[PDB]
Design a protein around this ligand. Structure first.
Ligand code: ATP
Ligand code: ATP
Ligand code: ATP
Ligand code: ATP
Ligand code: MG
Ligand code: MG
Ligand code: MG
Ligand code: MG
Lengths: 107, 254, 254, 107, 107, 254, 254, 107, 107
């Protein structure tokens, strides 16, 4: 019950892990979107939209090896790429988590 | 209300590039700003502000009274808060009196929020009038042995030769800014690191701006490089202006 | 006997680098040379000549008479034809009279063959006294739109404001020298080529000196870059010195 | 009547203790010069020019915590940095004194 | 149903994700053992024993940000620290998977 | 059965270090090995093999017939496949005949699987007798301009001056090995990279052995550094021994 | 007038580096010096003297008479007292007779003040001819167990195998010089201290030269390291030459 | 009667085409010397000494694909690497010929 | 006995080095043919027909600075310009050799 995606998740595609986690072991092209109501682990260069905990779970997490997402969002609280580029850890191994009502960006 | 001068001492460190970058960065934030090119007779600022074809009257006209300050200011086309008082090419830097530049600073201080003063190079009379009426000063430094020595002479001139030093007010608030910093050459040891300059000069860094081909491309098309946000330097210029407004940011691109 | 000034107008183009290189290139040839740092109060030449620990008396001491010209000149250790009259850090560029510098140029002309004058940046009084008693002038230019405009202002000041222009002798023989020329960036179009500078400025090139990490490495160890013959810039500096002495050489590294 | 300088004595600056001693409790940048007709005590890293006993007093002394001066001179007898680097006690706590006609460099 | 361990997993400790995945967001000290019948994600410096897919599953995976494990084992096929040091990707971000009957070590 | 000589040309690159390491690496694998110190009169191998207190008879005794080959060979204490035929300090390298060393190589080939020949430095007679009866040759190279030039002279002597070159058999199989490679200094450019040596010398690398304090620590306690597997060099020495036996391994520590 | 040989026994300790350093240090003092590269067939000295492109004739030509001593000597460009007689790469060390090298030493002794002989490594015939006609000898030693043992064999060969030992004159004046001394590693105990070498070898130290990255940088640009006075090793090399001329100096950098 | 050398001509080596031409189809390492009484064609990167027309022939020629020689000499008139770097065509395809008494360097 | 042709070898011309090599130091116009039973070295832009080893020698070679020949042939095995344009090294410095029975085109 942890869906593994071993192919490149090309632009326009959407992957929906309906029960829990989603592991993507390839590159996620810009325009692709990965949404799951558990956690999302992206072990490639992610350039798409990661949407964790979509059905109301403020304990979901996003893990990227290379933070280049266009959008990250846990349970609704998003953070677009415009203000993510401004912070450090852009293109770095990052760990996104929802603390109460704000997103965190750890390294 | 706040006259801050971009100075260095060592020529070519990037004063005009920083002056145009910080002058635009504070107009994007919303402050009604003017940038005064103080390099009279050797003008350079209007060329990289993209304002060179609109110049009719210049800095030395307002001093001599051949035009008014509204006739000489060039409103930008991309920004409404940004104005440029460009300089001449005919008359050199002796045609600026200390008294004549005092009048222009007075009526600029009534209308504007930030006055950025692009100082010319050296420790002479053209570099003294930009220093004089200033409230803060950004000192530009390359991470190299000469540019730190010659930027150290400058911080001692923003403490004794000012107007707030001969009239005894609070001294000029100084800020350090490393320009054309090459992070790869500081590991080979042929440039000073970010902490050697913070130790020898012993002040707080406003920011560190990497070596970039975007800087020469932006001045080649007329735009300041803080209006080029895709590059690495444009980011690094847009954080130094937030650090001017108190908002502390961790340094990047090193 | 032949006073030639290294000048530019635009700061940071490489005047001190060229001054130390051409002053050493003429001592390797055999001419008894002196280099005068004219940047009084913001000295840089002794740092890259490697003479900074031997300085006791400087340019402004000889002017005020606090020392003699033999007490202040620094013989090199590697060359016997090369001497350096360094400048101060305490007193700035107003402590140089036209009359006081006239006396030093007089008794320097009796002993030496070539006098190289490391001009400071700008069009002010420190850049005027180096210009004044000169017989030739090397104008230093970066291949960029700004550095050509301000090297164009300079050639019009080496034709009117000289001493051979107010006394009506033959005018100063001017030479153009492109420094930190990047051959890869002139094909992308973001720098001027070797022929755009030869067309806009419209004089004969003394040479084109490439962008090199060898220039910053040499000044970091105290050596001029013409004494580093393995690099590309050291070659190109040692051909411009032959082109100063009539020997025409085809340009390389372009 | 012992002038204390608690600020960094930046390059190009000159401090002149006209009556007696001069204590500098900060770093003296290269190009700065400290001259006094009494003693000079520099409790930082000195890289400038120390000129002790300038108005004729062969009993003045210079004390540095880190000897890196460009010039040291008591009553006229100088010693530039070129031959000071050759000796030991370069960068060491040093004590300069004029014995008759020569400078001494103690540790 | 993805057990998250946010504390340091000190030596002698054992963590057992009984249903599925196990995410460890801290350092796993040498001697600790993490065993789960789903995947194991270690986003710290792992120096213990990772035992993935313990109840018979040759499709489990191990992801470490810094490979310094004493043992990694998917569904029974192990690989001790002695021959893991010999390959590259020692101390590197690694992804362990079971292809038929041998373990793979990706970067 | 397989005589391979560890040679270099340039002294001090690490021949004895490599000789003891590769000779021990092949005994750990199981091959009955001997290492012959060929540096007669200036012996160094028994010192870092830890066998210096057990030496009674040496290489020059077996040649002159003052002892037998079983009386002179030193079995190790930690390994049973490893034996050492140490050299003298009294008699220098002229006391080795081509004929006398031919007999010792003959009866060594009957008992042993691998013979490692610790060559002395240079291109002289002591370095020629180790070269002569060899079947393979490891050339040791530091990543520096001098050590590549003199390891280039060596590969031309393992193709003409051998025994399989004067008798026309298949030539010596040569292998390259970079020792005391500093990965941090090749990015500053002051050493050659792993590909510059692979291009100028133009053969296949047996391996690249990093700069390590473990190498001097191991010879100070008597152990070869391949018996120190915790370090970085001990790893890199034990992979070059697999690369000697055909097993291709991707290079690490670069 | 004074033939002094730089020798060691153990290869790679730094003989060529010391030979080029001491050969330049005595030319800066004023003595008309020559340095003879005795490593015939494996030449290394002209590479770090920066003289490799000017070589036409070499050491083995003067011996065989294919050129004269004035045709083979290379006057330096930076020094007028310094000449280099470089060696070959084609012919190896058997092409130097004891009689042929005697003729070159005779007419070198008529013209020059100091003759520095860069000995090759080992105790063989190429290292014997450099030893033979010498008046003094600098023995190079690393602070390590092997390099002290193998430098001890060398001091006993400068007492019996010399020319002043077979002709019964005063023996060769020997000098010890520790090179690439790491002061940090002698406190960890993995290297010998400065006093353990002064005790085991039991002679007077000429000096102690630290481990330096400046040594590899200087040979990479063609200059001896005594012409690099900013570094620590260049200081330590320039004191050992004063200690050669009697002037006692307290050792530094330990 | 045109001797071809297809192997790398390593340093210290000397190749002597005794009758006529010499063609070298590999790299000639610094310190090697190639001498022939006819022409010399080097179709690799030459870094050694080319000595053409050695037995008295002022009509011999040297052709290099990459001029990096330490010395080139036709019939006795040489030209060392020091003044060859000063001209252009250093590292360029070059053609050396003897016109009367001076060497020429064509491209 | 190595014939040197220093003039332009115009169209229709044929040069026949009867004994050995042939060196052409000028441009060979299309329609010209250079045939020799040794090697052929063309140090200009060759656009004609090079015929090496014409009297039976499979060890001859052709060297051009700019490969634009209409035909190259060693000892009879030819290769017209139609299939030479298809390969790379057209207009590049090329080295033609006969390996057994096929022509080689090196760079
Ligand atoms: N951060 C940077 N990265 C790369 N290049 C830079 C940077 N800043 C400036 N430069 C380049 O350096 C040169 C410096 O010119 P600039 O006019 O900014 O100097 P300045 O501060 O005005 O000094 P001066 O007044 O003497 O000219 C410019 O040509 C510019 O392209
Ligand atoms: N040919 C070159 N290639 C690369 N970098 C160069 C070259 N010439 C100079 N530079 C670098 O450019 C900077 C210019 O400094 P330099 O002191 O030479 O300028 P200048 O001619 O003295 O102008 P100013 O007097 O205003 O300082 C130096 O840091 C130097 O390292
Ligand atoms: N991989 C390495 N990393 C760091 N240091 C090394 C390495 N290999 C050797 N060394 C050091 O370099 C020095 C070289 O000495 P070694 O006796 O190995 O040279 P060699 O190959 O025997 O040459 P020679 O026979 O001329 O002495 C030794 O002191 C050793 O400590
Ligand atoms: N004082 C020093 N500090 C650091 N490195 C050094 C020092 N002296 C020499 N080296 C380095 O050690 C190596 C020794 O090479 P060098 O040619 O000097 O040895 P040598 O005395 O000639 O012995 P051989 O003749 O066998 O080569 C050089 O690569 C050099 O860079
Ligand atoms: Mg400016
Ligand atoms: Mg200057
Ligand atoms: Mg050895
Ligand atoms: Mg040597």
């Amino acid at each position: 019950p942890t869906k593994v995606v071993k192919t490149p998740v090309r632009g326009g595609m959407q992957i929906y892990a309906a029960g829990g986690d989603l592991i993507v072991l390839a590159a996620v092209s810009p325009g692709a979107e990965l949404l799951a109501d558990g956690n999302i682990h992206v072990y490639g260069p992610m350039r798409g939209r990661a949407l964790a905990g979509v059905k109301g779970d403020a304990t979901a997490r996003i893990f990227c090896q290379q933070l280049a997402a266009e959008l990250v969002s846990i349970a609704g609280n998003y953070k677009v790429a415009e203000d993510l580029r401004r912070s450090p850890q852009w293109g770095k191994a990052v760990h996104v988590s929802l603390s109460g009502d704000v997103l965190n960006i750890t390294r | 209300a706040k006259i801050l001068v971009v100075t260095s001492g060592k020529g070519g460190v990037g004063k005009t590039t920083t002056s145009a970058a910080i002058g635009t960065g504070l107009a994007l934030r919303g402050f009604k700003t003017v940038i005064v090119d103080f390099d009279v007779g050797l003008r350079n600022l209007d060329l990289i502000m993209g304002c060179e074809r609109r110049v009719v009257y210049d800095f030395v006209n307002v001093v001599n009274g051949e035009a008014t300050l509204t006739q000489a200011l060039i409103k930008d086309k991309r920004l409404e808060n940004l104005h440029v008082l460009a300089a001449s090419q005919t008359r050199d830097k002796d045609a600026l009196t200390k008294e004549g530049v005092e009048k222009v600073m007075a009526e600029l201080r009534k209308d504007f929020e930030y006055i950025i003063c692009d100082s010319p190079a050296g420790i002479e009379k053209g570099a003294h009038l930009a220093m004089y009426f200033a409230d803060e000063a950004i000192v530009v430094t390359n991470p190299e042995v000469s540019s730190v020595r010659d930027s150290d002479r400058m911080l001692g001139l923003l403490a004794s030769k000012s107007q707030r030093a001969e009239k005894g007010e609070e001294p000029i608030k100084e800020h350090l800014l490393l320009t054309r910093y090459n992070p790869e050459r500081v590991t080979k040891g042929e440039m000073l690191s970010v902490d050697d300059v913070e130790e020898i000069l012993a002040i707080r860094l406003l920011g560190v701006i990497p070596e970039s081909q975007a800087v020469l491309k932006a001045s080649n098309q007329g735009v300041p490089v803080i209006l080029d946000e895709q590059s690495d330097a444009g980011q690094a210029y847009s954080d130094a202006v937030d650090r001017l407004l108190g908002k502390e940011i961790p340094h990047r691109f090193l």
